[PDB]
UniProtKB/Swiss-Prot annotation:
This is Poly [ADP-ribose] polymerase tankyrase-2. The chain holds residues 952 to 1161 of 1166 of the full protein. Disulfide bonds: none annotated. Ubiquitinated at 'Lys-48' and 'Lys-63' by RNF146 when auto-poly-ADP-ribosylated; this leads to degradation. Deubiquitinated by USP25; leading to stabilization. Zn(2+) binds at residues 130, 133, 138, 141. Belongs to the ARTD/PARP family. It is found in: Cytoplasm; Golgi apparatus membrane; Nucleus; Chromosome, Telomere.
Length: 203
């Protein structure tokens, strides 16, 4: 029972979500190899994801975590990129989405940099790029990211099961790079906004 509601570009919600997406683009150490070369996006659509089952599942787990962490869920809004967006918005996050080869163990990874999430849209390392042109830097084909509500709780600061007494891991990666986060329970993230976009070729 997932439905998707389109937001008007005149909606404050559309504008705040776009701004978060645009303002967290950075340059990457791969020179654009995985996610492409761009400074900004063309946002084409932003849809609100509404699923009562997945939400109650999220808030139930949020309450648990909160009570184990001095009444502090440590809830963030973070980006996630994946080939399986469609599965996520209907079935939610689960152990099948655990990135076994990730630097912080077999969990689900999120990012403050939208452009880091962009690198995983066509798979790990950008895969073979867009299905139509096999171009990881394609300026034509439409991409999709998720902007997710994420419960971090007590997060282990790093410079499958979570670390003992901790509900998530914070990776603190470079001075301009923002944090990346890992959760080990699928119930600790809710896929709230689905964003459709293109990367833009710099002028
Ligand atoms: O295709 C994927 C996969 C991998 C990574 C992300 N998403 C992200 N990975 C990140 C890794 C490191 C740092 C940040 C990452 N990130 N930010 N946003 N999304 C990701 C999705 C699917 N998998 C294969 C099937 O089983 C599950 C794993
Ligand atoms: Zn393409």
């Amino acid at each position: 029972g997932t439905i998707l509601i389109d937001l008007s570009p005149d909606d404050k919600e559309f504008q705040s979500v776009e701004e978060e997406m645009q303002s967290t683009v950075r340059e990457h150490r791969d020179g654009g190899h995985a996610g492409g070369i761009f400074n900004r996006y063309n946002i084409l659509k932003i849809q609100k994801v509404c699923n009562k089952k997945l939400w109650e599942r999220y808030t139930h787990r949020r309450k648990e975590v909160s009570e184990e962490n001095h009444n502090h869920a440590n809830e963030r809004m973070l980006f996630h990129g994946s080939p399986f967006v469609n599965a996520i918005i209907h079935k939610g996050f689960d152990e099948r989405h655990a990135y076994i080869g990730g630097m912080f163990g077999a969990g689900i990874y999120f990012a403050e940099n939208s452009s880091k999430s962009n690198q995983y849209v066509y798979g790990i390392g950008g895969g073979t790029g867009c299905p139509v042109h096999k171009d990881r830097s394609c300026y034509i084909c439409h991409r999709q990211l998720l902007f997710c509500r994420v419960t971090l709780g007590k997060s282990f600061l790093q410079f499958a099961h979570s670390p003992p007494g901790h509900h998530s891991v914070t990776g603190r990666p470079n001075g301009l790079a923002l944090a990346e986060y890992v959760i080990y329970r699928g119930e600790q993230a809710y896929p709230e906004y689905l964003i459709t976009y293109q990367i833009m070729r710099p002028e």
